[PDB]
């Protein structure tokens, strides 16, 4: 016997609620699954709609309704309204609204310029591809008015794939399952992070180079601590807003470069005051700026 051809349509209303630490995101949408069963008799020989709690009564009476699992859903999805549409020719359409937490690999190392791929993976829970196979998949997403107010900028239409997953721990040709894969590409909106985080940080790090224009070893060294303290004061401003991650981002590296630059100046200032009154090396008012930008370009090689 041939497998049941199941046609799938996924409507995505919203993708939001990224949890950087857990690498998860929420997806609100509809899922539609259509297949052809045996013909049946319906009231007035017209399509029959069966909603929510009444679905259970048809299943208990024999109506085949396979469970399709979201491979990458975290916990049970929040399923709202759902209906069946039973045609007399045998066609069956299952339609349900869902809100689920979904996971996938997410790399935030180029924050705030990172680019992510939001994925949904769908697969029958119990029926292999000799019994149930996905014949096609179509995706429909939100028509965006303007994205300037949005946190993520969608890039391209939804990508789809239909593949076969072969499991080695189910022992003839009965260990392959049909899997749908949907992917939404998006880029982070960096405007806020550019103006309120990166820019003020550059000013703070640049302003620490002003110590070299002070005409007293006393002034230069003392003010270096006020700068060190300014980078720290800025540290918990970024830590309180930027996402929690198990690795360093771009901004983080800037912050670390800031710590070193100020700490370097402390050494040079002290080194200048005991090397020979070396106001010539104290004229490193250009070396320090140049050295930082050089190492700064190398930082963003990823």
């Amino acid at each position: 016997a041939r497998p049941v051809d199941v046609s799938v349509s996924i409507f995505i209303n919203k993708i939001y609620g990224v949890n950087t630490l857990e690498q998860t995101y929420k997806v609100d949408g509809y899922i539609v699954a259509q297949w052809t069963g045996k013909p049946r008799k319906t009231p007035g020989d017209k399509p029959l709609i069966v909603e929510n709690t009444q679905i259970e009564r048809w299943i208990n009476n024999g109506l085949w309704v396979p469970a399709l699992e979201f491979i990458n859903v975290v916990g049970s999805p929040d399923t709202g309204n759902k209906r069946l549409m039973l045609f007399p020719d045998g066609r069956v359409i299952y339609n349900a609204r869902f809100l689920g937490s979904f996971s996938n690999d997410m790399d935030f190392r180029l924050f705030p310029f990172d680019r992510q791929q939001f994925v949904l993976e769908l697969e029958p829970f119990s029926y292999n591809n000799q019994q149930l196979r996905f014949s096609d998949i179509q995706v429909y997403t939100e028509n965006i008015d303007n994205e300037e107010i949005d946190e993520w900028w969608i890039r391209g239409k939804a990508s789809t794939h239909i593949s076969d997953i072969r499991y080695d721990h189910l022992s003839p040709n009965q260990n392959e399952f049909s899997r749908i894969t949907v992917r939404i590409d998006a880029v982070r909106n960096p405007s806020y992070y550019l103006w309120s985080f990166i820019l003020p940080l550059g000013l703070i790090i640049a302003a620490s180079w002003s110590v070299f224009w002070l005409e007293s070893f006393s002034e230069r060294l003392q003010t270096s601590f006020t700068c060190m303290l300014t980078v720290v004061a800025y540290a918990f401003y970024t830590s309180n807003i930027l996402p929690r991650l198990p690795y360093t981002t771009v901004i983080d590296q800037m912050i670390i470069a800031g710590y070193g630059s100020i700490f370097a100046a402390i050494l040079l200032i002290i080194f200048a005051h005991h090397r020979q009154d070396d106001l010539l090396i104290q004229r490193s008012r250009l070396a320090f700026p140049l050295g930082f930008l050089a190492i700064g370009s190398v930082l963003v090689i990823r």
Partner: nanobody
Amino acid sequence: QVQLQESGGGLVQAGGSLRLSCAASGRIFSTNVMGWFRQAPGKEREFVATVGRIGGSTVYADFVKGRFTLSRDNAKNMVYLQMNSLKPEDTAVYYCGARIGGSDRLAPENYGYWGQGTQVTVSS
């Protein structure tokens, strides 16, 4: 920013057909924000049609009853309103507007950059 120009309307007998076109030019990266409105003398400017939030959907006024169709051409920054089975009540000047903001595709308040309009007349 942008400017809108309607066209395609005229005189037609009850039951005929017309196809209105609206061309947009300026700072507009998508035709999703464009919407058709109509306003006959004596009544207030009422909504007709615009795109829906989810792809593949379209919002129509209750008086359309499936007779009008909103099509798109994102490449040419143009929208088209195919009006069929026209009634004498459809007589009005049909305006094309671009959505400024808010969050109500149906409210003209959220629309600006209106165009001159195209007169649509339907006799018996």
